[model samples]
Target: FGAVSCNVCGMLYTPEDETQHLLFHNQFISAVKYVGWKKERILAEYPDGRIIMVLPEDPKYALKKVDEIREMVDNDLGMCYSRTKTLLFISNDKKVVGCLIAEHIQWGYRVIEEKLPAWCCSTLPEPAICGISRIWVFSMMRRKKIASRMIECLRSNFIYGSYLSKEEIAFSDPTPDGKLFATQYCG
Candidate 1:
């Protein structure tokens, strides 16, 4: 087994399959870096920001809670296996402020089967879709417009044209059925 580093939090992991492990880590890192940190920064910029920082939800730290979070996403959102990723954002003061979950479905069934679907493909390729799964801001942090800011963060930074095409931008409600909430044009 070999170890790989997560681009977002720089965590290392070892799995039986090196390729699969790296792919998983990359997806996690991408989800966190683009989706997670982007949302956290947006929440921070708000005038009434109330987000707190916390450790990455891992089994070593809070195993049960981490599982619970995964359960919440699975139970609350009807995401297919291998199409979802999760990330956590903590405040500078070390408090559990919020979490960001990103779900992506790559263009072709074959590519999707590989689990490392390339973000850049033909403009009219199959259909690569990505979205913000869950953005939970603590109730105490309510009324601070954190949710809106988080959404903006994903739109403006994470899923921006830098990594993904503008046309592929998508977001959905956190309902169990995974309903789309909004979308943008490619141009």
Candidate 2:
């Protein structure tokens, strides 16, 4: 008895059976599809797709779909999940290509790379309202301002009555790409 893994999808299958291997391969490697939700909260609408916010109280199916996408992001970035609000970018084709998870926070430390020790207050903790736990865009969907659009939506919609300032939002252990974007965004 011998079994081999499908390299593209990482599913183990019997190598001798061509039909079974191909079937499982196709199913496992297909893009993550997201059907529109009923009574969904729309955050922003764009030409290519619309961004919708998912909360804990939403329908079970919606959460399940979000979990699937979250798992993909977890595997790609080698990170675990957190309990945060989910924002998904659903393309016209009904595929979830972007996800942003935001959480409420009271304080955050400013990023500082200290080379020369100085007596400055830059190490002081700053008050923050929102924290980005995780933000991911599909590989082919980067540089399209999807992440920025999601942040803009979060700033406006995370809390009502007033928009959040850039200084009031914090990022959690940003990756290099995230760091670069944050620098450009908060600059």
Candidate 3:
């Protein structure tokens, strides 16, 4: 009807057609209204006295920042999901130094149990595992623990009535660096 801002990627659009964007919105809504989300800014210091932080903001600005992040990762939007909750790690001047994109999934007993990862099997168990769609930091921002902190923010209640713990998480595909991160910090 009116302008609906996608809560995941903070995309604002006055829908012209029921395109792929709608699918993204629906899937993302399933995560937000039915599941949950997490995102925050922490104090980061730059040698140049930059006020570094990571947070999500207005849809217009957020989407623009995401486009920049895509450019830095040297990758195109592999698949456009209408909805995605992402964080921007920024510098004092408000430039995106890093970005993490993820979504909430209420995974239940596998649609087909035989072919699913254990951590993704069921949300009914106890602690739920979150899914990380993408995590990227510009080359200049590498070596820092921004990625680790960003992953930590994704943890949340496993379910309507769930427990907490070390937390389990799933990733799409991982790059070599991404694999290293998962091997070290994501375990």
Candidate 4:
């Protein structure tokens, strides 16, 4: 095994475990600090129905930085952009079933600040962290299940972990009341 320095603590550990630990810790800390204790429910679901804790993505509101946040999302998620809107499509079993577009906001800083502290107080760039935006499912093909599966796939394929006891998949909230959700992947 190899070793690497943690982004937060800077302590060195086995390379694989270190990455997992750092990612987990970063998300965990961010979740606790920015996300409201009540909104913590966003991080408690998995494709397999297993519960796991995860972080909520920062929402895009008026007055908040727009260009910076959009750029981050594009870079982080490889999402395509057109004008001021971003389209996110979800495909399952090789079929395109769900889609949503996140648009840049023009106003409402005070309202957003009052509603979402994670966005107002977060220091990390939008791409590195999750965004608090609305998610719309256009088709009717197991939207929830497909989303859960997509997150699981992203974690298994991109997020590496050796000592990681589990993984969480963060997503945009589906309902007006919900702001975010997470599914855990355990080793």
Q: What is the TM-score of each candidate against the true structure?
A: 0.40, 0.72, 0.51, 0.26
Task: Tell me the whole-model lDDT of each prediction, alpha carbons only.
Answer: 0.44, 0.75, 0.50, 0.32
Ranking by lDDT: 2, 3, 1, 4
Please provide, for model 4 over 1-187, each residue's C-alpha lDDT reduced to its tens digit, 9 standing for 90 to 100.
4556555433345737665666554543332222122332222233433222221243433112233333333322323233122222323222223222333222223213346353463343233222224333322333356454434433333223411113122234445313233322221
lDDT of 1: 0.44
Candidate 3 on 49-157: residue-level lDDT in tens?
2222223343454455455455444432334444456655654434455667765555524333356453465446533455667787645557887776555544432
Query: What is the lDDT, from 0 to 100, of the residue 98 in candidate 3?
Result: 62
Score candidate 3 by TM-score against the native. Answer: 0.51
lDDT of 2 by residue, 1-187 (tens): 5776555555455635667657544543453677676888888889999999988767778888777777667756653334468898888988776899888664456664568562345666666568888898876678998888998898988876779997778768889989977886754
Clashes of each: 5, 0, 2, 10
lDDT of 3 at 90: 58
Q: How good is model 4 by TM-score?
A: 0.26
Worst 10 residues of 1 by lDDT: 177-186
Q: Can you rank all candidates by TM-score, best first?
A: 2, 3, 1, 4
